[PDB]
From a paper:
Here, we study the molecular basis of the CO2-generating steps of anaerobic ethane oxidation by characterising native enzymes of the thermophile Candidatus Ethanoperedens thermophilum obtained from microbial enrichment. We perform biochemical assays and solve crystal structures of the CO dehydrogenase and [name] complexes, showing that both enzymes deliver electrons to the [name] cofactor. Both multi-metalloenzyme harbour electronic bridges connecting CO and formylmethanofuran oxidation centres to a bound flavin-dependent [name] reductase. Based on the crystal structures, enzymatic activities, and metagenome mining, we propose a model in which the catabolic oxidising steps would wire electron delivery to [name] in this organism.
The crystal structure of the Fmd/Fwd complex from Ca. E. thermophilum was refined at a resolution of 1.97 Å. Compared to the initial prediction of a molybdenum-containing enzyme, the anomalous data confirmed the presence of a tungsten atom in the active site, therefore renaming the complex Fwd. The Fwd complex forms a heterohexameric assembly in which the canonical polyferredoxin FwdF subunit is replaced by an [name]-reductase module (CAD7775209, named FwdI). As FwdF was reported to be required for large Fmd/Fwd-containing complexes or supercomplexes, its substitution by the FwdI subunit prevents the formation of higher oligomeric states. The resulting Fwd complex is consequently the smallest ever structurally described. FwdI shares a similar organisation and (metallo)-cofactor content to the ζ subunit of ACDS, with the exception of the absence of the C-terminal extension involved in dimerisation. The six [4Fe-4S] clusters dispatched in FwdBGI would allow an efficient electron transfer between the tungstopterin to the FAD of FwdI, therefore possibly coupling formate oxidation to [name]-reduction.
Author numbering:
A (entry chain K): 1 to 351
B (entry chain A): 2 to 567
C (entry chain L): 5 to 82
D (entry chain B): 2 to 430
E (entry chain J): 2 to 126
F (entry chain C): 1 to 253
């Protein structure tokens, strides 16, 4: 049995495992859900008015619950479609040839370069990227210019609700957005396929029917929004972030590096990440990460046919440089993937 | 047109005729004071004349009987008989086809038989089969024990609403009386459960079987119905159930009858007078039930006599049917009726030396012989549950001969004699008491004696049975074989003045009539009741109310009895 | 009632699933009186095909997701 | 005028909540009926008049008396006459067909021989644990569609009784239930289900035998894989069956026409019987035509059997010996009457090749494949549209079909009454 | 030619014109064979192209159609005279022919489907 | 001994029910009395003489009476039904119900036998040199008991439902057997020298021996330790366990 938003409150939001993706807000046909402080909220006054005058519209809907990455699929159709969307890919290592991107990117700048090409080529009208404010609090945006893409390059380890810029399907259609590409964590890419896998999803007025390309980032875990402030960090002097064996490495303007140990980061890990077993995103057209490739290069897993097409276009046009990933790097990727699977199974049974 | 039966010995208990040599005159299907010289004459010298046989409890038509016929082609094959210039083909033994149902009743000397249970939703099927049963007059009792509208009215203590639904339900099903089977149990069976007793609340309705029985008895009397409530008690076929059966009768002592008759008729008490706590110590407690009956004039019962051999159990008691089918590893037919009742059909074979069957066989006989009033215990086999009605002559001969009973007991287990008191019973019913148990009592409990059935008084229907037996020269105790044959093959069976059978052979196949009760209630009672029933039809029933009630096309020859609130 | 509209394609087979699950239809069924031939149902079947009443349709996702033939669809033309 | 509470005359769901708009004796609109029902009720081009095939091999128009007399002569003069169809006419007409079969000493067979006949054979072995459709509507939290595609064959079954309806004990409807489909291909019924168990063709008897073993706690005798299905999946199915509050299996042609035939249904009847030791469980055959159930009911209460051979003036029942296709494959039929059924289009080719060589009488309102082989063609008024009659729903509930429009065509009852009278004169009865 | 297991049964379009068997709508709904993606690709033909389905009991020519729910080796012919030209006529000791699960072969063909009257004419003498 | 030779003098396509062709009924009768024996050609009540030329040699008891049918009779049913003694030799094929309900004697069919051959056999011997159709040694619809005694030997193949509801006696098939031999077996012994599939569904007691290959086993049998029957190693199983059965199923290894 599914109980729409009420089920999400009892089993995900109030349970403390919400990944703040925003998918529930982006699927609701009655615009009941909206993201506030990166937390899903419902307009209960509007729901009560609709139910009192027109009936129980959530009863046989449950679209928000079937779209949540923290709700297990239960129906045959959704499970069948999700399995068909799971794809293995060829592992390679790539790096951008455009200097403005390499100056701000996290590794090889493949995400920023791919999105740049998709916009310059007219393949997409907009892209969902993660920008940030002065305090490094992520700000998801639907970008259509290079300036906005460069301002989003780099990696932030707190939540950036990829679906918040897509909660108004009417406005997107009014603004001429017919094709959109998105970048997100495996939880966010899995959420995209969860909605697309819903029976008759293509007949709903949702942004999931106009998303043409999906990049899934490698992700070990995300931290709560309190991490920066509580950890007492001179944010004004911060230039970038990067999590590795030594812990969260905060690069500073002086060239110095404040290293926070993984042992201190345990209290900041999001509860929803502790039960996540998806490291490489088998649901993305192309998955991009750091592990397995040399520093300054991005590990790319080209999975779908559209991913292979776009990847070759970037190569044919000299927009990226490619190299092979050694056996050592291939095993390291598979080890991190099994590591997350084992820790997720342990934390799930624990509950 | 005119028929005269002369020089016969008449046994008419309804009018107190105890074997008098009197002539029976019939004109235009009705008994008259005298007929003309041109009347056809039957010289019944040395023969016994009785009213046409009446069977107040038998499973002769409907879904349950047809389920038995479909699931039992082996039974069908066992009683096949080709067509003749007068008759259509026959089939079955425990579940005969509609044609043989009427032919075999006529051949046995019966002119009227009533269907023991009509489900309201599927009453059209019952009436469709009635239209194909030849000769006999027919009627049926409508099921109300596990009805949602009944239980709702019982919970609200609204007897006026209940009476309106019973009157409406009888018209919808074209029924004659109120049948109650395992009250509450059918509803509990909706989720695979059963009521454990009289005070076990029914899930989802907050009423108890006892509350359902008393409320329906009160509604039955408010509607001045000809028959009392017909009851198949809770805990049927379970050791120690004799206490529930007696307790149910005690709780009904406080209900006043609207007419001069019983306030309750408890059917097939053979299956509800069980002693012990498990099958190991199982024993007959007919003595306890008979003792209570001998001091309680508000109750009538029928034997539900067991007959050794093939049988097909069929009842609205879904729980006991499944339980018995599992116990025997037998075929199991189930038919839950939405919002109304349960149904189960299980083939059975009663065998001698099976201690449970031997004790059950004795219970029916013990109930009849230990109850002083012959009118209080009707002869039945709960056809075909206890055994096919064609076996009534065996039961008659057992009731009239302690010698036949002794010979039959010798063929059973030794444990039977230790768990029954039948071997020590020497009572033998005479010809007059057999007429009571085979027609007069059946018509009396149903109130049909006031509508021309079960008697040979002037004004009654010309339904007569002439048996080739001289009551003055035959000792029914010693010559029990002769008694059995005489009752098995009556010399003549007369239906409405027309000879329909002679010595077990059909001679004419006229069409019989369907008896049903049209009970009227004040408009406010119906209006209040229809508020609830219309809601049930709008949300839960799977059929439209406009297509639910049985139409006149299924009752082509009715005899509508008028009843209702005073 | 809304910026969008819910429509039924010719793939509809008149199964009545939409007419049974619609929140508007279910609310009307709970009234003092209910006649499926006259009630202002948001979606109902006639001649084996479903039709939407735009004056009362919420444009929710109930009939879209449950339609076994995939005949129900939302339309919005800027 | 609007006629309310009309009854569909197409599938065993026998929907009785239709409202029909009639203008100038023509049906204009049909409310709530699915495509299948609406198309039948709205009508097609019908046979305008009776016809008899001449020496030239052409169907020439003839009077109703000429066609009926030719039909009576054909049937009375036969030693092995077969009367097939009946499933699409009323019980009153079926009763007349049974009486006609008796007078001519013929075989009367329903469409059941090629449909749920094996189900009846299984019921004759184990008994049928079923319930009226309203019971499952109000209580079923588990519904399994086994070898049936209701999305295409019983379109309103799900919306009227099996899934989306709210019940007295299921306040939400579909969300209060779990439905499963067992089939060899992913049908539209399977796509919308909570679970789809794709099995190998003709493997149902093994699958049900293994599930029953697991329900009874005898999993040790079940191998790791049964007909390509893992044991762990079968254990999960058994778990769903024993953990539900009220379960119902709705099965169809996938069990009756596949390998093992009736053996598939009797093992399922044993599974339902065993399941009742754990929870409440029932089963219902998804009966085809609106009145296939009715013929089996009438024939059984009048003869003792669902189908019958009355050659020796006494009922004889034995599918595999006296069924339509058994007799046609053996080439032992010398005359046939096809009424309310299309043998030419729905029997195997080998049977038609033999049926095409015998005198054939067709009683049907529309021209179809059987008309190509018919020597006598008699148009009839349609039950549930042009005349009243009784029909039985798939769950045994009988309802009275309603007359919606007036017609000058003869009803099946009238055509058969006239054949019976003429046959009696020929026979000397 | 490809080995297949034929299943016959109901389709909404087949039932919608079941009482109008001489029409083009009935022919379009019943003279057809639904096949899965692997079999259609291996056949090397497009939807609408004619195929010959052959069994030990007969052969029929009907246009091909795609059904993504059909696994490899499973073909479906809607019930009707075209399907009944290849089904198993054996009654299996209970009066039931083999309508579902008939072994056969499917192959492209230059031949054309036969209308209902022509198909019935083949069974006449 | 008394020998009655019946020679087919026709070839009607309509099934003829001739349950009256038994050494029990023919014993002591004249050629004319045997010719006037009732047979049913469909709904046509007629005489045996219309279908056979009758030649008699002697007059003895049923036990010493031998009937010889010279030719195939693939449309004559119930031949030898209920016979208690004597011999019936059929020089060709025979229709359904051959030896049905027979209690004694012997019937030898030189050709093939149609469905229900030896159904409800209580005793005696039935030999079929050719093949058998469905329900060989089975019972009637809805009956819990079919074959109760006697021996049926088929030298060729048999089709589906061999020995359905068997309660005793023995069935030997030298060829292959169709689907589901030994359904609900309750005391019978079935031997199949060839191949078969899904044997002993719902068996309660009895023995099924298959010397050929069993394509598929019903998942209701408990495998036991292999056993040697006359030196031949057999795979042994007990079941149907789900039906509470304890019958034995032997499949040659
Ligand atoms: C929380 C998090 C954890 C990660 N953990 C790992 C890991 O364990 N191992 C590993 O190999 N790689 C990990 N990555 C991926 C890695 O840090 C790089 O983002 C990736 O290699 C792409 O680099 P790039 O130079 O090719 O792309 P770039 O050109 O640098 O662009 C990166 C893209 O990621 C987007 N982005 C940044 N932060 C977020 C966020 N919080 N949510 C959604 N989108 C965002 C940006 O908008 C930008 O479009 C993680 C990323 C994130 C966001
Ligand atoms: N549109 C339409 N509807 C109709 C009819 C019609 O002709 N057309 N006719 C009506 C009649 S008369 C009837 S009886 C009903 C029948 O309705 P159904 O019982 O649904 O009959 P089918 O659709 O022929 O087949 C049922 C399903 O069985 C599956 N199947 C095939 N082989 C196997 C197997 O080995 N195992 C299993 N488990 N499944 C298998 C098929 O894939 C199919 O989906 O439809 C009725 N409704
Ligand atoms: N290949 C294959 N073949 C099959 C099947 C399969 O699944 N696959 N299924 C089989 C099954 S289960 C069945 S039941 C059959 C289909 O069963 P059929 O009865 O052959 O189905 P229809 O073709 O609809 O034939 C019904 C006929 O009755 C007529 N009719 C309708 N109403 C009336 C009326 O009131 N009176 C009279 N006299 N006639 C009326 C119609 O015009 C129509 O011609 O097909 C069988 N054949
Ligand atoms: S169940 Fe549907 S309408 Fe209700 S809140 Fe969820 S997505 Fe919105
Ligand atoms: S979809 Fe995302 S935002 Fe909504 S409840 Fe689920 S995890 Fe939270
Ligand atoms: S660990 Fe999983 S849930 Fe947490 S941010 Fe990464 S992909 Fe999302
Ligand atoms: S729109 Fe869909 S659910 Fe509604 S009647 Fe049509 S096919 Fe059925
Ligand atoms: S969109 Fe919602 S309100 Fe409108 S017809 Fe569909 S279910 Fe009814
Ligand atoms: S489901 Fe069947 S009975 Fe109901 S409208 Fe459709 S075709 Fe008619
Ligand atoms: Cl009267
Ligand atoms: Cl529309
Ligand atoms: Cl011998
Ligand atoms: Na922007
Ligand atoms: S059917
Ligand atoms: W059918
Ligand atoms: Zn009773
Ligand atoms: Zn009773």
């Amino acid at each position: 049995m599914m109980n729409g938003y009420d089920q999400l409150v009892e089993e995900v939001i109030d349970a403390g495992i919400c990944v703040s993706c925003g998918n529930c807000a982006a699927v609701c046909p009655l615009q009941y859900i909206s993201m506030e402080e990166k937390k899903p909220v419902q307009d209960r006054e509007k729901r009560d008015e609709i139910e009192k005058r027109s009936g129980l519209a959530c009863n046989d809907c449950n679209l928000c619950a079937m779209s949540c990455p923290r709700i297990e699929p239960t129906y045959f159709w959704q499970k069948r479609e999700l399995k068909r969307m799971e794809h293995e890919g060829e592992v390679k290592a790539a790096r951008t040839t455009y200097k403005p991107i390499q100056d701000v990117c996290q590794d090889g700048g493949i995400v920023t370069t791919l999105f740049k090409y998709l916009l310059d080529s007219g393949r997409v009208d907009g892209v969902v990227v993660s920008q940030y404010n002065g305090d490094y609090n992520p700000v998801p945006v639907l970008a259509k210019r290079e300036d906005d893409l460069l301002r989003a390059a780099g990696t932030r380890y707190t939540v950036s609700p990829a679906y918040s810029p897509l909660t108004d399907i009417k406005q997107l259609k009014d603004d001429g957005y017919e094709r959109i590409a998105i970048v997100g964590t495996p939880c966010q890419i899995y959420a995209l396929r969860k909605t697309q896998a819903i029976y008759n999803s293509q007949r709903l007025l949702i942004p999931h029917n106009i998303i043409t390309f999906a990049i899934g980032l490698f992700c070990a875990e995300e931290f709560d929004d309190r991490i920066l402030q509580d950890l007492e960090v001179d944010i004004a002097d911060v230039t970038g972030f990067d999590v590795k064996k030594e812990g969260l490495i905060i690069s500073l303007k002086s060239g110095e590096k404040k290293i926070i140990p993984h042992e201190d980061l345990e209290e900041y890990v999001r509860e929803g990440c502790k039960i996540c077993s998806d490291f490489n995103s088998p649901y993305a057209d192309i998955s991009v990460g750091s592990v397995g490739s040399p520093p300054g290069w991005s590990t790319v897993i080209v999975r779908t046919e559209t991913g292979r097409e776009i990847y070759q276009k970037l190569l044919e046009k000299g927009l990226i440089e490619e190299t092979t990933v050694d056996e050592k790097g291939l095993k390291l990727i598979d080890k991190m993937a099994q590591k997350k699977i084992n820790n997720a199974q342990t934390k799930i049974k624990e509950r | 047109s005119e028929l005269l039966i002369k020089n016969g010995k008449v046994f008419d208990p309804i009018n107190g005729v105890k074997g008098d040599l009197m002539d029976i005159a019939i004109k235009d299907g009705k008994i008259v004071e005298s007929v003309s010289s041109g009347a056809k004459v039957i010289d019944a010298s040395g023969m016994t004349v009785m009213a046409g046989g009446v069977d107040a409890h038998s499973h002769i038509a409907g879904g349950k009987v047809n389920v038995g016929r479909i699931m039992r082609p082996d039974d069908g094959r066992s009683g096949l008989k080709p067509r003749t210039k007068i008759t259509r083909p026959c089939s079955g033994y425990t579940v005969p086809n509609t044609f043989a149902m009427g032919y075999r009743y006529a051949e046995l000397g019966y002119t009227t038989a009533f269907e023991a249970a009509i489900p309201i939703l599927k009453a059209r099927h019952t009436h469709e089969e009635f239209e194909d049963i030849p000769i006999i007059d027919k009627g049926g009792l409508t099921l109300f024990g596990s009805n949602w509208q009944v239980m709702d009215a019982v919970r609200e203590g609204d007897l006026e609403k209940l009476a309106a639904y019973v009157a409406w339900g009888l018209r919808a099903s074209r029924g004659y009386g109120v049948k109650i089977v395992n009250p509450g149990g059918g509803e509990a069976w909706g989720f695979g459960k059963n009521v454990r007793g009289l005070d076990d609340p029914v899930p989802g309705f907050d009423v108890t079987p006892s509350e359902i029985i008393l409320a329906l008895a009160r509604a039955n009397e408010m509607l001045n119905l000809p028959h009392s409530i017909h009851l198949h008690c809770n805990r049927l076929g379970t050791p120690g159930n004799y206490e529930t059966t007696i307790e149910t009768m005690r709780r009904l002592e406080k209900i006043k009858p609207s007419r001069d008759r019983q306030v309750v008729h408890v059917t097939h008490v053979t299956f509800n007078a069980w002693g012990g706590t498990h099958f190991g110590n199982f024993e007959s407690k007919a003595d306890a039930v008979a003792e209570y009956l001998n001091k309680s004039d508000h109750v009538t019962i029928d034997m539900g006599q067991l007959i050794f051999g093939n049988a097909t159990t069929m009842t609205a008691d879904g729980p006991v049917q499944y339980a018995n089918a599992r116990l025997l590893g037998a075929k199991w037919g189930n038919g839950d009726v939405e919002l109304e009742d349960a149904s189960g059909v299980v083939p059975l074979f009663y065998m001698r030396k099976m201690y449970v069957h031997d004790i059950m066989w004795a219970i029916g006989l013990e109930l009849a012989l230990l109850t002083n009033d012959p009118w209080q215990v009707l002869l039945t086999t709960d056809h075909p549950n206890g055994g096919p009605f064609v076996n009534y002559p065996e039961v008659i001969a057992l009731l009239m001969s302690a010698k036949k009973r002794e010979e039959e007991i010798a063929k059973l287990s030794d444990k039977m004699q230790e768990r029954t008191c039948l071997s020590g019973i020497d009572r033998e019913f005479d010809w007059y008491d057999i007429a009571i148990k085979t027609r007069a009592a059946h018509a009396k409990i149903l109130g049909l004696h006031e509508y021309g059935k079960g008697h040979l008084g002037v004004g009654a229907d010309g339904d007569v049975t002439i048996y080739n037996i001289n009551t003055e020269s035959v000792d029914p105790s010693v010559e029990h074989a002769a008694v059995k044959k005489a009752f098995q093959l009556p010399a003549y069976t007369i239906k409405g003045g027309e000879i329909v059978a002679k010595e077990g052979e059909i001679t004419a196949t006229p069409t019989g009539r369907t008896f049903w009760v049209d009970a009227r209630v004040p408009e406010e009672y119906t209006t209040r009741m229809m508020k609830d029933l219309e809601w049930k039809f709008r949300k839960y029933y799977s059929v439209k109310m406009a297509n639910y009630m049985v139409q006149d096309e299924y009752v082509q020859h009715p005899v509508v009895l008028e009843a209702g609130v005073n | 009632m809304s910026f969008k509209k819910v429509k039924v394609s010719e793939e509809c087979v008149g199964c009545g699933v939409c007419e049974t699950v619609c929140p508007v239809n279910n609310l009307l069924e709970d009234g003092a009186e209910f006649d499926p031939d006259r009630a202002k149902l948001a979606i109902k079947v006639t001649n084996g095909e479903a039709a939407v009443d735009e004056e009362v349709c919420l444009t929710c996702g109930t009939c879209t997701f449950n339609c076994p033939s995939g005949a129900v669809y939302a339309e919005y033309e800027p | 005028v609007e006629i309310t509470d009309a009854i569909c005359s197409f599938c065993g769901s026998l929907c009785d909540d239709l409202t029909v708009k009639v203008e100038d004796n023509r049906i204009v609109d049909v409310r709530r009926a699915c495509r299948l029902g609406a198309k039948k009720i709205l009508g097609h081009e019908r046979i305008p008049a009776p016809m008899i095939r001449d020496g030239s091999g052409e169907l020439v128009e003839a009077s109703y008396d000429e066609a009926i007399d030719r039909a009576a002569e054909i049937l009375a003069g036969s030693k092995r006459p077969l009367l097939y169809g009946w499933a699409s006419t009323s019980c009153e007409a079926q009763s007349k067909g049974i009486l006609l079969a008796e007078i001519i000493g013929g075989v009367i067979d329903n469409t059941a021989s090629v449909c749920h006949g094996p189900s009846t054979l299984a019921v004759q072995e184990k008994g049928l644990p079923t319930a009226s459709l309203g019971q499952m509507k109000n209580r079923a939290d588990l519904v399994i569609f086994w070898g049936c595609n209701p999305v295409h064959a019983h379109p309103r079954h799900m919306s009227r009784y099996s899934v989306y309806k709210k019940g007295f004990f299921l306040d939400r409807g579909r969300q209060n239930r779990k439905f499963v489909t067992v089939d060899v291909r992913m049908t539209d019924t399977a796509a919308i289900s909570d679970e789809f168990i794709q099995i190998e063709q003709g493997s149902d008897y093994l699958i049900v035998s293994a599930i029953r073993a697991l329900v009874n706690g005898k999993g040790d005798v079940v191998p790791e894989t049964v007909a390509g299905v893992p044991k762990e999946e079968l254990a999960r199915v058994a778990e769903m069956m024993t953990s539900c509050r009220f379960g119902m299996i709705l099965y169809g042609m996938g069990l009756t026409q596949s390998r093992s035939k009736y053996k598939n249904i009797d093992i399922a009847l044993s599974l339902i019987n065993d399941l009742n030791t754990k929870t409440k469980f029932v089963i219902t055959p998804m009966r085809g035509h609106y009145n296939v159930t009715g013929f089996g009911q009438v024939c059984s209460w009048q003869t003792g059997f669902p189908t019958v051979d009355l050659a020796r003036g006494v009922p004889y029942y034995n599918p595999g010996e006296m069924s339509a296709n058994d007799l046609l494959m053996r080439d032992e039929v010398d005359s046939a009457m096809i009424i309310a059924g299309d043998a030419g289009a729905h029997f195997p080719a080998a049977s038609i090749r033999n049926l095409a060589k015998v005198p054939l009488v067709q009683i049907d309102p529309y021209p179809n494949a059987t008309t190509e082989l018919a020597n006598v063609v008699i148009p009839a008024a349609i039950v549930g549209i042009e005349c009243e009659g009784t029909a039985y729903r798939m769950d045994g509930v009988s309802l009275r079909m309603r007359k919606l429009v007036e017609s000058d065509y003869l009803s099946d009852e009238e055509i058969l009454d006239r054949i019976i009278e003429k046959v009696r004169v020929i026979k000397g009865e | 030619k490809r080995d297949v297991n034929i299943v016959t049964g109901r389709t909404i379009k087949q039932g919608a014109d079941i009482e109008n068997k001489l029409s083009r709508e009935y022919f379009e709904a019943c003279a057809r064979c639904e096949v899965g993606p692997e079999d259609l690709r291996a056949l090397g033909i497009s939807e609408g192209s004619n195929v010959r389905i052959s069994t030990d009991f007969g052969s029929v020519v009907v246009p091909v159609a795609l059904c993504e729910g059909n696994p490899t080796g499973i073909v479906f012919i809607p019930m009707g005279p075209w399907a009944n030209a290849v089904v198993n006529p054996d009654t299996h000791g209970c009066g039931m022919p083999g309508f579902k699960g008939v072994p056969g072969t499917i192959e492209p063909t230059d031949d054309t489907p036969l209308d209902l009257k022509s198909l019935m004419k083949l069974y006449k003498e | 001994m008394q020998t009655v030779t019946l020679t087919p003098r026709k070839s009607s396509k309509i099934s003829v029910e001739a349950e009256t062709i038994t050494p029990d009924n023919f014993a002591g009768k004249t050629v004319e009395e045997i010719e006037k024996v009732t047979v049913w050609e469909g709904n046509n009540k007629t005489t045996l003489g219309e279908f056979f030329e009758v030649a008699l040699d002697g007059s003895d008891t049923p036990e010493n009476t031998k009937i010889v049918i010279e030719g195939s009779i693939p449309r004559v049913k119930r031949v030898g039904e209920g016979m208690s003694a004597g011999i019936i030799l059929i020089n060709g094929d025979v229709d359904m119900h051959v030896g049905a309900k027979m209690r004694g004697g012997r019937i030898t069919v030189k050709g093939n036998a149609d469905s229900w051959a030896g159904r409800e056999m209580k005793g005696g011997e039935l030999i079929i040199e050719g093949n058998a159709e469905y329900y060989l040694g089975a019972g009637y619809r809805g009956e819990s008991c079919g074959m109760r005694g006697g021996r049926i030997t088929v030298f060729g193949n048999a089709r589906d439902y061999v020995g359905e509801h068997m309660c005793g006696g023995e069935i030997i098939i030298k060829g292959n057997a169709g689907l589901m031999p030994g359904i609900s077996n309750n005391g019978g012994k079935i031997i199949i020298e060839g191949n078969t599939t899904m044997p002993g569904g719902e068996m309660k007691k009895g023995t099924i021996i298959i010397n050929g290959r069993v394509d598929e086993l019903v998942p209701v049998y408990q495998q036991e330790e292999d056993e040697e029957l006359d030196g031949v190693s057999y795979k042994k199983y007990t079941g149907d366990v789900v039906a509470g059965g304890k019958g034995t199923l032997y499949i040659k290894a």
